[PDB]
Design a protein around this ligand. Structure first.
Ligand SMILES: CCCCCCCC/C=C\CCCCCCCC(=O)O[C@@H](COC(=O)CCCCCCCCCCCCCCC)COP(=O)([O-])OCC[N+](C)(C)C
Ligand SMILES: CCCCCCCCCCCCCCCCCCCC(=O)O[C@H](COC(=O)CCCCCCCCCCCCCC)COP(=O)(O)OCCN
Ligand SMILES: CCCCCCCC/C=C\CCCCCCCC(=O)OC[C@H](CO)OC(=O)CCCCCCCCCCCCCCC
Ligand SMILES: CC(C)CCC[C@@H](C)[C@H]1CC[C@H]2[C@@H]3CC=C4C[C@@H](OC(=O)CCC(=O)O)CC[C@]4(C)[C@H]3CC[C@]12C
Ligand SMILES: [Ca+2]
Ligand SMILES: [Zn+2]
Ligand SMILES: [Zn+2]
Lengths: 665, 189, 37
């Protein structure tokens, strides 16, 4: 039999001090007033009593929303501590104003009235509080090591983290940004960037910072949405302190802001400068004009080089024409590379005509690469992740040219490749040239972002590469373990290449042998076993060691099972789970990428294609006026969205009943 | 210490012109009438004042849905601009009829009362508006290259696109197809 | 202390819903009717 009792006992009640609490709970004004005045005359009661549910007279008045009992209690000199915070958090303007005009608490001691107003995001009460000179502390830099920060973290770290989070949550309020801010858009950009940076540093508190950054981005997008004229749109997008604001938004990774329909329409208008009917055109005529502009790229380049100011001179300044010319030049370079492969008995031959034509394009590519790193900088150069492939290709081409010139200078004989050594400079140069051709042909993937059908697909594939890289580590660990074991088992029976039928050793021969004799060969065999290109008799020895053969076969079968049946199927499940979430924002990511690609062609520098490449207060006032108009529209819209819900409004009957009762009285 | 202040400051208030706004907000008919007549006799108040939340006397009457204060304010010769649109968009038939019988705006300048009625898709108010001879502009063919279309797109393209979208959204209303159409099925197709 | 805070928070979460509270008009109507009587 479980003796149910009270373990933590509170104080007793049911005196006159509880009588007048329950009178206030009833709320009848006359009875409350008479009981309170009688108790005050008697001078034997207090006002510190607490109900079992955790509410007092003032808290119950807060919950019931009765201004008459509110003013009566406040004029009766009841306790006032935290009552302003409770009223602000209850979100009633009349009692907030009344309390402003004049133990156990569910409020953190660091909470300020302005902080709570910012947390609750109420425009009216926020303005009412901010009309007085109220301020907010500064949280220190992200990696501050100053004595004040180290000391405060040492005395109490949980309170410090909570205070920082509360300060940032109050600062990231859309209303508190609408007021007391000269540039709300820039403020939102910087705040979102700072919160995104803070999320990584504060590992335990990540979701809160991420949601604050998302809220800032959404506020910026909603503020942009209210523009209702092309003049206002261009003023906003061109304000600086062209398209400086758009460049800043691209830098700060504001994909929702960038992918706005109005901004995209303006960008398309700027992009299709030469053609004004490109929107209303047939696919056949678009294709025909595409070839007819791409075919005359050398003529256009020569015309611009000769006469920069002419009818044909300025025809290449348009971004679309420049993009078409660059694409045609790259396609011509790739065609030359393909034609190159279509006497081989000389040692270090002079370059042929195809290589002579290929060299100016390669030199131009390198020149264009260095200028962009000099103009952009190291961080911008490495952020693209395509410049890595560009640098690798250019370095490989430079090494190929150097090796070819070295071979030409050194060797001058005529000997067969069957007698040439394995480390010949000519052979090294051909291998590097083949790798360079592979990389250059693979470089064409970056042009898929300009298309409507392939951009999101390419963006989705790029996102999944990360999961591929993550699984590669586990696969490599398993492969290393099994290769170590197999080599340790099989390294005893190594045989020389002379004893083999065709003087061939390894797995790249018809007589596959010595598959696990060395660690490198074991790694190669275990890699090739995934695709089923390794035979089954490689796990055999010339001697009759049936136990050893069976153990090796068991190891091989276990590795095959683990690699193919379990790990490969698990990768597939991860790809599906990742792509399900990836497919949601494909449009936004593709539009951001296409905007970056489009703006990459707006600059005046580098107009020519690679082969020929080698050879101020009025604006502030206008922006302020437009920002004021947008803020007013946004405030109205968000007030309405707050009014969209709770459609079953009340107290209209109470107000009318009070009025008619007074008239009857 | 972050100095919180006001960056964009509006006009001041709390005069008799704000007194009678908050009287209208209270909505007591006798008090509103006596205050309004006293202010009219004094001849020192206006009716153009705006609350901090973006509402006026007529807008608050729209939101509160009080026909008596509505007719009192309208017979007191308050400003009437856009009030018909606000009433139609609030979707109250009594005040829509009363307003039909007789700055900062959250409505696009191209919005027409019939267009807003079609957007909101209210059969009764749509019929009440369409009983009068009201019409709708034609958007041009899909690939129109005519001078009027090219010129209007050149002066302002965002407004042109918005106007086209609003016209088509008004035209694609199921109620506006049920009325004023001989073959609703073919029209919908 | 933790129990008190948790009880307050869960009472509030119970009060978070049913925001369209009633019987306030009934109590006021009963009071004014008695005063009129
Ligand atoms: C991403 C990272 C960057 C990737 C691109 C780097 C480009 C840089 C290229 C640098 C090329 C230097 C060649 C020097 C030759 C010197 C020589 O005589 O040969 C020596 C051996 O030489 C070799 O073994 C060269 C091996 C080149 C590997 C290239 C990998 C490309 C990967 C591509 C991407 C996959 C002779 O040695 P020995 O005398 O026998 O002793
Ligand atoms: C003896 C050796 C013989 C070697 C033989 C083979 C040689 C070639 C090897 C090729 C290996 C695969 C290379 C694939 C390159 C194309 C991949 C395209 C897929 C894709 O969308 O990836 C983008 C990046 O490209 C990338 O993935 C760029 C990666 C660059 C790697 C360069 C390595 C050299 C993502 O776009 P993004 O995320 O970059 O977008 C900008 C963000 N700021
Ligand atoms: C991290 C991932 C962890 C994964 C853990 C899974 C482990 C795999 C366990 C099963 C290994 C079976 C190896 C059998 C083998 O090498 O046999 C070859 C050898 C060759 O002589 O044959 C045998 O030893 C027995 C032959 C019969 C085996 C029947 C199949 C049993 C296992 C089926 C698994 C599913 C396919
Ligand atoms: C996977 C292939 C290439 C074989 C490599 C074998 C070892 C060199 C690897 C396999 C697992 C690795 C470990 C995996 C994870 C960790 C935890 C890691 O912990 C942290 O990074 C702690 C700090 C933090 O992340 O907050 C430190 C390295 C260590 C021990 C790694 C050390 C290197 C190990 C032993
Ligand atoms: Ca590049
Ligand atoms: Zn510090
Ligand atoms: Zn036209």
């Amino acid at each position: 039999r479980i003796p149910l009792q009270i373990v933590r006992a509170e104080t007793e009640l049911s005196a006159e001090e509880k009588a007048f609490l329950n009178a206030v709970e009833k709320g009848d004004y006359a009875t409350v007033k008479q009981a309170l005045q009688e108790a005050e005359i008697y001078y034997n009661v207090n006002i510190n009593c607490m109900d079992p549910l955790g509410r007092s007279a003032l808290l119950i008045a807060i919950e019931n929303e009765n201004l008459e009992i509110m003013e009566l209690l406040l004029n009766h000199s009841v306790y006032v501590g935290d009552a302003l915070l409770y009223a602000i958090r209850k979100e009633v303007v009349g009692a907030v104003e009344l309390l402003l005009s004049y133990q156990f608490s569910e409020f953190t001691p660091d909470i300020t009235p302005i902080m709570l107003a910012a947390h609750t995001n109420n425009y009216e009460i926020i303005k009412l509080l901010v009309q007085k000179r109220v301020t907010i502390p500064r949280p220190h830099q992200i990696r501050c090591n100053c004595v004040e920060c180290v000391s405060s973290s040492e005395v109490d770290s949980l309170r410090h983290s909570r205070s920082r989070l509360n300060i940032y949550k109050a600062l990231a309020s859309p209303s508190l940004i609408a007021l007391s801010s000269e540039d709300p858009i820039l403020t939102a950009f910087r705040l979102g960037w700072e919160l995104k940076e803070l999320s990584k540093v504060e590992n335990e508190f990540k979701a809160e910072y991420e949601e604050l950054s998302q809220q800032c981005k959404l506020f910026a997008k909603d503020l942009l949405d209210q523009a209702r004229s092309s003049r206002e749109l261009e003023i906003i997008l061109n304000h600086r302190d062209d398209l400086a604001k758009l460049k800043v938004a691209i830098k700060y990774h504001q994909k929702e802001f960038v992918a706005q329909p109005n901004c995209q329409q303006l960008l398309a208008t700027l992009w299709y400068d030469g053609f004004p009917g490109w929107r209303r055109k047939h696919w056949v005529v678009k294709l025909l004009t595409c070839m007819t502009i791409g075919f005359l790229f050398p003529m256009l380049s020569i015309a611009y080089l000769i006469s920069p100011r002419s009818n044909l001179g300025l025809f290449i300044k348009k971004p679309f024409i420049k993009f078409i010319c660059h694409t045609a030049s790259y396609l011509t370079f790739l065609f030359m590379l393909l034609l190159a492969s279509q006497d081989l008995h000389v040692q270090g031959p002079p370059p042929t005509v195809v290589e002579w034509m290929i060299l100016p394009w390669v030199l131009g590519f390198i020149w264009g690469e260095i200028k962009e790193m000099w103009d952009g900088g190291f961080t911008e150069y490495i952020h693209d992740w395509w410049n890595l492939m560009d640098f690798a290709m250019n370095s490989l081409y430079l090494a190929t040219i150097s090796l070819k010139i070295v071979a030409y200078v050194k060797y001058n004989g005529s000997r067969p490749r069957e007698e040439w050594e394995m480390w010949h400079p000519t052979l090294i140069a051909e291998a590097l040239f083949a790798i360079s051709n592979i990389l250059s042909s693979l470089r064409l993937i970056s042009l898929f972002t300009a298309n409507s059908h392939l951009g999101p697909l390419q963006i989705s594939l790029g996102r999944m590469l990360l999961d591929i890289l993550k699984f590669l580590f586990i696969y490599c660990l398993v492969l290393l373990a099994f290769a170590n074991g197999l080599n340790q088992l099989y390294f005893y029976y190594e045989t020389r290449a002379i004893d083999e039928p065709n003087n061939c050793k390894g797995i790249r021969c018809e007589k596959q042998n010595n598959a696990f004799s060395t660690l490198f060969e074991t790694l190669q065999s275990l890699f090739w076993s995934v695709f089923g290109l390794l035979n089954l008799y490689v796990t055999n020895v010339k001697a009759r060691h049936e136990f050893t053969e069976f153990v090796g076969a068991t190891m091989f079968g276990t590795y095959n099972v683990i690699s193919l049946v379990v790990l490969l199927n698990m990768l597939i499940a991860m790809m599906n789970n990742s792509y399900q979430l990836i497919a949601d924002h494909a449009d936004i990511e593709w539009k951001f990428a296409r905007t970056k690609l489009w703006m990459s062609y707006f600059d005046e520098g580098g107009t020519l294609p690679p082969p020929f490449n080698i050879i101020s207060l009025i604006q502030n006032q206008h922006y302020q006026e437009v920002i004021r108009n947008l803020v007013k529209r946004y405030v109205a819209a968000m007030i309405r969205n707050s009014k969209t819900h709770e459609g079953l409004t009340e107290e209209n009957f109470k107000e009318l009943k009070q009025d008619i009762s007074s008239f009857r009285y």
